[PDB]
Amino acid sequence: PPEIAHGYV
Amino acid sequence: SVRYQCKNYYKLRTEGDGVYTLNNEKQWINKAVGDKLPECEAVCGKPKNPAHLDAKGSFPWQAKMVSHHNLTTGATLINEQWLLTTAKNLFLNHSENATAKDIAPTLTLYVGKKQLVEIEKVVLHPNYSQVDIGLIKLKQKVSVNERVMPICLPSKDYAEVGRVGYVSGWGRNANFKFTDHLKYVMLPVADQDQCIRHYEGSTVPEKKTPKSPVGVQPILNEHTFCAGMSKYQEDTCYGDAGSAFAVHDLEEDTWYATGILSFDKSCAVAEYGVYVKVTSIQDWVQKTIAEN
Amino acid sequence: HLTPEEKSAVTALWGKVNVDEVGGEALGRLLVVYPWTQRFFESFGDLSTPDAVMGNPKVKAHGKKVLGAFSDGLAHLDNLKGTFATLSELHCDKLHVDPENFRLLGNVLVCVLAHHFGKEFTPPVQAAYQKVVAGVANALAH
Amino acid sequence: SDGSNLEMRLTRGGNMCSGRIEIKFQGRWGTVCDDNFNIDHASVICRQLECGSAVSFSGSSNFGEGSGPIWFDDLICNGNESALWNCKHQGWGKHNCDHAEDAGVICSKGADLSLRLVDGVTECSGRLEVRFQGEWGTICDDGWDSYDAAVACKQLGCPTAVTAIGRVNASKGFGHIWLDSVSCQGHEPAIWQCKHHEWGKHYCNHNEDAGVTCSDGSDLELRLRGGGSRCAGTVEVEIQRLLGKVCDRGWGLKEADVVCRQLGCGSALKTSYQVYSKIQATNTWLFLSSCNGNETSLWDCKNWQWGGLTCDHYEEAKITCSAHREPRLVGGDIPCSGRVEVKHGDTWGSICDSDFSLEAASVLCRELQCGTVVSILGGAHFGEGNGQIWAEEFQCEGHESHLSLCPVAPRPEGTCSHSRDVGVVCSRYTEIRLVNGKTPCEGRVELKTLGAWGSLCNSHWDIEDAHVLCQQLKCGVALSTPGGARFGKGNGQIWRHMFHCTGTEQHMGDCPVTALGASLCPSEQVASVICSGNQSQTFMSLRLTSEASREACAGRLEVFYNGAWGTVGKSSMSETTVGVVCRQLGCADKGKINPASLDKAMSIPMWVDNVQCPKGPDTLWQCPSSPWEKRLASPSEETWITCDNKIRLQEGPTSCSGRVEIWHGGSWGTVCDDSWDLDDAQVVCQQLGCGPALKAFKEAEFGQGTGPIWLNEVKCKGNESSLWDCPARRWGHSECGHKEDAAVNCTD
Amino acid sequence: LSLRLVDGVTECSGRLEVRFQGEWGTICDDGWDSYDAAVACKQLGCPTAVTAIGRVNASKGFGHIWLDSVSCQGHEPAIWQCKHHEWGKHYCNHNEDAGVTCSDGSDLELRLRGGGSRCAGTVEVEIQRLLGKVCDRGWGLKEADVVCRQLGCGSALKTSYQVYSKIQATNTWLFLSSCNGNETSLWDCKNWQWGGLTCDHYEEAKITCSAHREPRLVGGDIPCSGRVEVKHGDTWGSICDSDFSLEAASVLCRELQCGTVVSILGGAHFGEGNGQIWAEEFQCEGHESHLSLCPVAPRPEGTCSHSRDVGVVCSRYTEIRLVNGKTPCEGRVELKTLGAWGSLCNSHWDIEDAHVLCQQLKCGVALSTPGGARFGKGNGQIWRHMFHCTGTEQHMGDCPVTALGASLCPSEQVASVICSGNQLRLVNGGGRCAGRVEIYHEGSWGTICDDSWDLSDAHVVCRQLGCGEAINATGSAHFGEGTGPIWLDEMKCNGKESRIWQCHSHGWGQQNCRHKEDAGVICSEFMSLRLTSEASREACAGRLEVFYNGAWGTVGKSSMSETTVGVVCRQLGCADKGKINPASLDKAMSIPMWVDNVQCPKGPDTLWQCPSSPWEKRLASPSEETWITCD
Amino acid sequence: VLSPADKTNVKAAWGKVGAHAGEYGAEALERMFLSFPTTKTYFPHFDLSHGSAQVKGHGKKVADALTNAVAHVDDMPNALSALSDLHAHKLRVDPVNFKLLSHCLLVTLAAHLPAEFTPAVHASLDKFLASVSTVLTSKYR
Ligand code: HEM
Ligand SMILES: *[C@@H]1O[C@H](CO)[C@@H](O[C@@H]2O[C@H](CO)[C@@H](O)[C@H](O)[C@H]2NC(C)=O)[C@H](O)[C@H]1NC(C)=O
Ligand SMILES: [Ca+2]
Ligand SMILES: [Ca+2]
Ligand SMILES: [Ca+2]
Ligand SMILES: [Ca+2]
Ligand SMILES: [Ca+2]
Ligand SMILES: [Ca+2]
Ligand SMILES: [Ca+2]
Ligand SMILES: [Ca+2]
Ligand SMILES: [Ca+2]
């Protein structure tokens, strides 16, 4: 999955 | 499936849902917003460890700015990339004809534990002779953590008479020396009539005179409010200008910037200090952030 | 550092001090002149007027303790940092006293010494005691 | 509304007849602004509340800020209405005022005002206290001056002649300080009718309480206490019956002059005295403020204070005045000389000749504007001083400006009386005038010597001498020196004194003067001058002769003139000419005149004849005589003399015994007894022509009185011709004490 | 958790390291105390005898720092059980890491180097084969005494050096905090850090103990006299007379507590030495407390011959002891002259001499002086030394004393003192019983004016001084011009007064005189000397005459020793020895014979002490006249 | 802030100071120069040796200014207008130095006037000197 700014999966 | 979550001191602001299920097309599709990811914004006003008192706690929004002749002043961190300060702070060591482009490359700005941050541009108020306020834009977003955190703007007016607010400052102490460690003090809001009479003589536009006990007149008008000394006769002094008048809203457990200190020359010799209402400048602030 | 002449002057004048009087007077003057210092001594009772402060027995006891600690440092003028480690730890860990308050108390102590010893407190001994109190304040800083 | 339902009130005052003005209207309490507020509004207000006779009005929330609406602003009232709402105004509730400008009023029915004086010497001296709303309080001295004291004294009803400030003898008060910065002009009927600071806000303390002292003027006295006269000492004040001192906060000669003028002692010289006595202690002080200097008394100085302050680290004021030891010259037959009498206050007395030196003579001649000492003639002379004889050892040092400053060392015993008083002469004894002119600043020059007037010659008369002359006669700078008999020909004696004035000297007597043999002049040749008349505008030698001996003080007299010597007339030589000659050649005070002898060896022509000296000069060049005439002369015309021997003894039981005296420099003296040996006593009595010595004494033998010690440590070998050849040290300087003068006893 | 010592000089010394979470880290030195060192040592397998703190020879720290302000009471065995605030949450830095230095006790040795001997010079530590220096961070006499005490040297006089130079230098230091001063060795002084800091703007510690140069006197029969030997820490030698000066001697007698110098002597007068010879220039300023304190010049290459020894005699050479009393503070007073004991005559002995003799033996103040044979006459001779103590000195030998032909003492008058057991001088006169007279008042010295000065007045002063009757009363500043104040103007005593302050006078400060009129007195007990001939009024070759009682007289030839003529010449200031010789029969004045048999002992500097037969005036033949010539 | 009681105490104390004002000011300047050497940077042309007449004159000037301020305690900013402009703009004296000099002044007066320095008067004098300092440094920028 793609990353988002300042966020985790 | 994956569920997106924002790390400590952040929060998802987009609508829909942060859960994304993998497709047979091998696309990541949230059944609400589809292909669009969320973004993580920063908590504004929730200090980790809340509360002339030494600051070893949580005033993360406080910034320290030093002019090119070694004079220290203050600034307030409004969001991850903008700071709010006093116009007179930016006009240190040059004629008031100087443009905003001549001010930005001459300032040093610290946050947290002496962490240096770079400045990109400065935006003074269009009417800074009456609303003495200015904005600082950082080159890149600051990383929110235990030591750095914004104090986002209020929705309602907390400048009620009697309200006690907290003021952090990097300015001069009782020995007129710039403080080595950050300090804070709890100050109540005073009524306008007494402050105006104390500094200008009368509330009538005519037959006003300069009566300031310190020899310098504050900018008193409809965009300002006054705060008196503390229970133990503690007051702000030189260098505290640009700091915020923070109010703790107990119903929401959030800290709100109700005012920015403008007149920091009382130093316990004058009774009241003058702060610029944030609610009266919120539209200009939002317009400048959005326009850049 | 203090020159041998300065150390001689400091230790010569310090012999005529009433250790059970000067400390209480200095602490009371600190509490009166700088009201916020009363915040740390809320257990001492009435502190709201100069007469109440100067007549307080707990104030005199604690001034005695403070001047005893000060005199102990006067015998270790080259190793102030280590002499005052425990007091520094106390004042930072439990009370959170700003380091400038130490300098205020030192200056008040200098004023009290001048008041008691009159014209004998010539400018050179004042400068020596300024160095001493600055050292003590820096040692207690953190 | 006709005004019936309205009601007025005074709040936050000391009582119901004082405080902030408040009015109810439409159910709300409200105030009145202080714009255009004056005593007329107050009088109108203190009429409808039954409190009478408005005393004062206030502004700027003197009684605390009010609340509610403001009803009135910029009202004009005429001082006599039924109520405040009858005045003309712009409109109800219309204003540009705020609650920092509320009005207030004090009416008389409440403030039962009164005044009193307490804790002082008399019924109306002491500390002032004002009663306000039943409580007694004091007045701060800030702004308190003589005009306020005058108003207070007149209010209390006691003499307004002299009204000074200061709480004499009174202690700090207790309670309120009601008044401050009182600004009375001096004619108001009460102290509170003047302008003063608001009753509330004063930063004064009770060490500053005010007071007054009212008097008729007959109870204020001034004296100098401690010292040898009424004209020197610590200045002490007796006001009422209280004794006190003056404080030197601003003490200087300018006000010392006023004090001395008051006491009648002349002019102030020094700010100290000689402590001839002890003065008692006192706790009250007088404080002065910059007297202008031309006041006739110390009481007329502006704002002098009698008590109410301290003189910590300061001391008492003290002065010595000109009349402390003022001198006088009496008995002298010619100006600027004669016997001396000194004044100690207001009593004139003589001083023994045993206590007066040449420094004293110089200061004396300077003080009396007579010049510098020319002669001291110790011993009964110029008559006798029949009166009181002061016994004060004068120790004058340097050249003090006035005789009063000279240190003096009194004694407790009596001394010489009517045999050894002393005289003095100075260099200001010239008798000259202008005559035969239309104005006193032009005319012929005449000069008196002996007992005759005559016409002065112009042989050496010059513009400098003319300027000095007109400076003497109060005629300013000279203009020119006309020649010939421009103001008449000579009709009498023709004096020929050629003066040599430098022109910078105030009186012609102080110039060098030459008269002996001066050139003959005809009657048609006289000196004359003309001057502006505005005061504002600004070698020779005398010798004596004898065979195989020269420069000795016995033989024929001669004068060197124009490159040659010559003889002077024997005819008519008087005793005073002999005295002058001997004092000039220095071998004596005087001598005798005797016929010629065989010792002459030089047939030298005669230069002058008929020598006669006047009183006053100390050399022979200032002695009138016939003019120069180089005629041949016979021995009967030649002049021969023999001075008196300089060494004489005194106090001895007989001749050939007694202390050893010596004459030099004009006045007699003694010798010191260190090294006093039989060789010197062998020279002493042989010099008298008596015989060999037999004993010499030490340790106070034969008197310890008068004179300077012209010699000491006489290392005389015993075969000397004279006592002045000995190598005695430091001629004239007193290294020895006075208890150790010389003494000799030797065989007849 | 674990402990580790790394990169120190030995396995039991170095930086202290602790392992936590699998990563090693160092402790912050703040608050590190000797108790912490003891705890860290007891947790490890190293000796627990001595535990000093600090980084010995360790390099700068690196990595992580785990703990700060570790505080151990010493009651538990492991370091991490002690008190600390939190792990890693501290503001320390790697330049301030702690350490320890375990030791077993028999390795700490201290030695001073760079100076005259082991007891002077810089302090040089050598511990675990690493040798460094002490720093002046808290160095003074209080700590100095310990080092001198530890080395066997005495009290520490100063921090300096004289003689040798060129010491080595090392970058490791010993730091003391403060140690009260009574410790037997430096190591016992609390919290002595070894290494870690290079102290800048503080210099190295230096010492000069009393044992650096110590004087001694041996070869003499009178207590305070003989040749001078000096000890160089542990060795000895002789002192030449060429390089010894009076300023050094005054100190030599000062530290010996023998009073002050009364004579300095050269040559092997006290005996030739039998050892090594010292050569050292003494350069004392005069008021120094010890010889070592005085500066010192380096040794020269030359040496003196053994016939060049030096010697001194000080003021305190009178042996006085009390006997026949229950306590030693009450018995009769005894004395020695010429190799024989004796008992003192009380004929001229007041309470003042009793005060002094009681203070000598720590008997406190005097109480009374019994009369008669109150403690036994004694078997020894009765001594005739008239004592004239001023009552302030603390020994008999200090006082003025004279016995030359004193009157015969009656048998039963032996002096004694009962102890508690707890201002007139004649100046410029020469001798003690003559000259201008002065009195001490307003705490200042002043003279008496000459007016009314007559022979009756002069009686009182010399009864007050004990000098017998007056023979002259002089004025016109016979004995010089006095300086300072003039106090007494005129004196009208009755002639019978005991003290001058009881006479009729105008009172202190009242006067009418000048300095050229100062008064004086000459009294019967003034003595003087002379050697004269037919062709010289004063010399030192001819007949010997003595002044006494206002008149001159010749000295006796019978019983004349060799020491007498030496004393005579020394008093006349020509020679230290003399020879008798025949002379002519031409009597100059044919004066009387004053005293018969003179015999000067060893030690005195004049002839007025040497005892002999009491005075009696008689005629004598020229054969009985003493004729002396001084070389 | 200065209360009426503080103003009374200041007036009493400064009245007792009296004519010794110049001596006290010169002594205070000497104390400051001896204890805080950094203050000497603003007097480069001054002979700062012991008893220098220049230092005495400057001390008397300071004492006269303080007496003028005590007279006009209610309108200090106007009384010290020129001195405020001088120190803030022409000399650019840093505000730390003013507290140093105020402490030196208090030390001097306490040394010389033991009886007058009751703790209340001490606090009032601190307030007065703090007000003077704040007025003189307010325009500093
Ligand atoms: C209570 C605080 C002070 C007062 C009332 C005061 C008063 C004065 C006065 C009366 C003058 C004379 C101005 C003139 O003559 O025109 C002056 C000048 C001056 N002041 Fe201050 N002063 C104060 C504190 C200080 C301090 C703390 C400093 C520096 C550390 C300072 C530095 C100077 C200098 C350098 C001058 C110029 C002197 C000259 O040019 O001769 N002042 N001040
Ligand atoms: C005082 O001293 C003087 C000398 O200093 C003595 O005077 C001499 O005394 C002798 C004694 O025989 C006489 O021969 C001399 O003639 C005296 N000299 C003079 C100048 O007269 C005097 O004797 C001493 N006083 C006493 C009491 O002996
Ligand atoms: Ca108005
Ligand atoms: Ca109006
Ligand atoms: Ca006054
Ligand atoms: Ca007036
Ligand atoms: Ca004489
Ligand atoms: Ca002679
Ligand atoms: Ca005499
Ligand atoms: Ca006599
Ligand atoms: Ca006399």
Query: Do chain D and F touch: 3 or more Cβ pairs under 8 angstroms?
Result: yes
Q: Do D334 and D429 touch, CB atoms closer than 8 A?
A: yes
CA angle E142, E143, E144 (to 5 degrees): 90
**Into which CATH architecture does domain E2-103 fall?**
Roll (3.10)
Neighbours of ion ligand 9 (CB under 5 A): E 450-451
Consecutive H or E run containing B117: strand B115-117
Cα(E84)–Cα(B35) distance, integer angstroms: 54
Q: How many angstroms separate the CA atoms of E464 and E352, rounded?
A: 13
Domain extent, residue C107, equals 1-142
| Chain F nearest C-alpha distance from D331 (Å) | 54
Residues in chain B, how many?
292
Last residue before each gap in chain C (C to N over 2.5 A): none
> How far from each other are the two terminal CA atoms of chain B, in whole angstroms?
37
Query: In CATH, what class is E213-314?
Result: alpha beta
Query: Residue D70: what are its φ and ψ, rounded to 5°?
Result: -105, 120
Whole-angstrom Cα Rg for chain A = 5
Give Cα separations from E280 to D67, E293, E297 (angstroms). 101, 14, 7
Q: Determine whether the interchain pair F34/C126 forms a contact, defined as Cβ–Cβ distance below 8 Å.
A: yes
Tell me how far apart the alpha carbons of residues E231 and E213 are, in angstroms, rounded to a whole number: 5
What's the one-letter identity of residue D730? R
Number of domains in chain F: 1
CA angle E493, E496, E497 (to 5 degrees): 65
Q: Give chain B positions within 8 Å (CB) of A9.
A: 2-5
Q: How far is F89 from chain C (nearest CA, A)?
A: 28
CB nearest to B173's CB, from C96, C97, C100: C100
* Domains within chain B, CATH numbers bracketed: 1-41 (2.10.70.10), 62-149+282-290 (2.40.10.10), 152-277 (2.40.10.10)
Is D100 at the interface with chain B, CB within 8 A?
yes
Chain B residues touching residue C96 (CB < 8 angstroms)? 53-54, 56
Cβ pair B40:A6 closer than 8 A: yes
CATH T-level assignment (fold) for domain D114-215 = Mac-2 Binding Protein (3.10.250)
| 3-state secondary structure (DSSP) of residue D166 | coil
Reduced to 3 states (helix: H, G, I; strand: E, B; else coil), residue E466 is coil
D7-106 under CATH 3.40.50.2300, yes or no: no
> In chain F, what residues touch C54 (CB-CB under 8 Å)?
119
Pairing mode, if any, of strands E23-27 and E64-67?
parallel
* Closest to B167 (Cα-Cα) out of B115, B109, B235, B231: B235
Please tell me the experimental approach by which this structure was elucidated.
Answer: cryo-EM
The 3-state DSSP class for residue E206 equals strand
DSSP annotation of B191 reads P
> Which CATH fold topology does D432-531 show?
Mac-2 Binding Protein (3.10.250)
Nearest CA-CA partner of C105 in C122, C129, C78: C129
Q: CB of E446 within 8 A of CB of E439?
A: yes
CA-based nearest distance A2→chain B, Å = 8
E519 Cα–ligand 9 center, Å: 9
Nearest ligand 2 atom to alpha carbon E471: 27
For chain E, the domains span: 2-103, 109-211, 213-314, 321-419, 425-523, 528-630
Closest ligand by atom to F22 CA: 1
Q: Which two tokens stand for residue D477?
A: 């700078």
At the topology level, CATH places domain D325-426 in: Mac-2 Binding Protein (3.10.250)
How many of the other CB atoms lie within 10 Å of CB of E155? 13
Domain count, chain C: 1
Q: Do F96 and B177 touch (CB under 8 A)?
A: yes
Chain F touches chain C, with at least 3 Cβ pairs below 8 Å, answer yes
Distance from Cα E484 to the centre of ligand 7, integer Å: 20
DSSP chain C: ---HHHHHHHHHHGGG--TTTHHHHHHHHHHHHSGGGGGGGGGG---SSHHHHHT-HHHHHHHHHHHHHHHHHHT-TT-HHHHTHHHHHHIIIII---THHHHHHHHHHHHHHHHHHGGGS-HHHHHHHHHHHHHHHHHHH-
Instruction: Name the minimum distance, in Å, from the CA of C33 to any CA of chain B.
Output: 11
d(CA B268, nearest CA chain F) in Å: 6
Interatomic CA distance for residues E379 and E373, integer angstroms? 12
Is F20 known as a binding-site position?
no
Q: What is the DSSP letter of D16?
A: T
**Contact E471 CB / ligand 2 (< 6 Å):** yes
Radius of gyration from C-alpha coordinates of chain C: 15
What does D31-77 look like in DSSP terms, one character per residue?
Answer: EEB-TT--HHHHHHHHHHSS--S--EEE-TTTT----S-EEE-S-B-
d(CA E63, CA E57): 19
- C-beta atoms surrounding E176 within 10 Å: 22
Helix (H) or strand (E) segment spanning residue D463: helix D463-472
Q: Report whether C115 belongs to an annotated binding site.
A: no
* Contact present, C and B (at least 3 Cβ pairs less than 8 Å): yes
Pick the CATH number of E425-523 from 3.40.50.2020, 3.40.190.10, 3.40.50.2300, 3.10.250.10: 3.10.250.10
Is the CB of F82 within 6 Å of ligand 1? Answer: no
F106 ligand 1 Cβ < 6 A: no
D290 vs D664: CA distance, rounded Å: 53
Please check whether residue E86 touches C, CB under 8 A. Answer: no
CA distance D716 to D681: 9
B175 in C contact zone (CB under 8 Å): yes
Q: Ligand 1, from F64, F83, F84: best to mutate by most atoms within 8 Å of Cβ?
A: F83
E strands present in D369-491:
373-376, 389-390, 392-394, 408-410, 423-426, 432-435, 442-449, 452-456, 478-480
Q: Work out the end-to-end distance of chain A between its first and last CA atoms, rounded to an integer number of angstroms.
A: 8
Give the domain extent around F128.
Answer: 2-139
Phi, psi of D305 (to 5 degrees): -120, 135
Q: Looking at domain D649-746, what is its CATH homologous superfamily?
A: SRCR-like domain (3.10.250.10)
Q: Which CATH number belongs to the domain containing residue C141 in this structure?
A: 1.10.490.10
**Which of F76, F93, F129, F131 for mutating ligand 1's site (highest number of atoms within 8 Å of CB)?**
F93
Distances (CA, A) of C66 to B194, B241, C25, D715: 43, 36, 11, 83
In chain B, which residues have their Cβ closer than 8 Å to the Cβ of C38?
Answer: 232
Structure tokens at E400: 């003025």
3-state SS class at D149: helix
Please tell me the distance from the alpha carbon of residue D161 to that of residue D72, in angstroms, as a whole number: 49
CB D169 within 8 A of CB D120: yes
CB D735 within 8 A of CB D672: yes
Across the interface, whether the CB atoms of C76 and E138 are under 8 A apart is answered yes
Does domain E109-211 bear CATH number 2.40.30.10?
no
CATH number at residue F49: 1.10.490.10
From residue E187, alpha-carbon distances to C77, E376, E561 in Å are: 22, 59, 62
Longest dimension (CA), chain C: 44
Contacts of residue F73 in chain D, CB cutoff 8 Å?
203
> Which one of B194, B198, B204, B211 makes the best mutation probe of the D interface by having the most chain D beta carbons within 10 Å?
B204
Residues, CB-to-ion distance under 5 Å, ligand 5: D 141-142, 208
Nearest to E101 by CA among E146, E147, E136, E58: E58
D702/D706 Cα distance (integer angstroms): 12
Calculate how far, in angstroms, residue B202's C-alpha sits from the geometric centre of ligand 4.
13
Q: Which DSSP string do the residues of E372-400 spell out, in sequence order?
A: SSTT---SSEEE--EE---S-SSSTTTS-
What Rg value do the Cα atoms of chain F yield, rounded? 14
